[PDB]
Design a protein around this ligand. Structure first.
Ligand SMILES: [Y+2]
Ligand SMILES: [Y+2]
Lengths: 99, 99
């Protein structure tokens, strides 16, 4: 797809087999979802920095599907105001910024 | 240009005649710089919101240039950890996300 940026670029994503909405966010290094359940082991990861650090769970090699593209990426699971697709997942799907 | 997403997509921009580096950030509604001086009329604007809102100065129709594309946009001036080119400016330059 080619996505213009007059609205927030939210997309439907299937992550670890679950359907969610998430924002295509070129300002975010990492991908993060709240309220999904992923199986297997994870590594704790300290993220954020404002007012303290947030502890989240980092999962490796998680299946992700966006617009028919099935890829694998690192996914953090923890509290987030909205779900974020960061540049880690964007590089897997081959997304570029163009003008 | 076509900008891949393996690193943070910083670009050099000229804003109000002053040369700055800033992040192309499809997760940001607005464009914000710290430590530029803009002339002319501004109004305070409350932005952000998690933890409280941040007060910034909003300037209209500011000249912005990126990779030789001269556009006009709203620019907010106030505290920000990195300067940000948000969706308001990216729609003016015709930037899209593509995969
Ligand atoms: Y929540
Ligand atoms: Y952001």
């Amino acid at each position: 797809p080619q996505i213009t940026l007059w609205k927030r670029p939210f997309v439907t994503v299937k992550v670890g087999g679950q359907l969610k909405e998430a924002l295509l966010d070129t300002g975010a290094d990492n991908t993060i979802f709240e309220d999904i359940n992923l199986p297997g082991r994870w590594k704790p990861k300290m993220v954020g920095g404002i007012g303290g650090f947030l502890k989240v769970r980092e999962y490796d090699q998680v299946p992700i599907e966006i617009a028919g593209h099935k890829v694998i990426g690192t996914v953090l699971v923890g509290p987030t105001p909205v779900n974020v697709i960061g540049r880690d997942t964007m590089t897997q799907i081959g997304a570029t910024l163009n003008f």
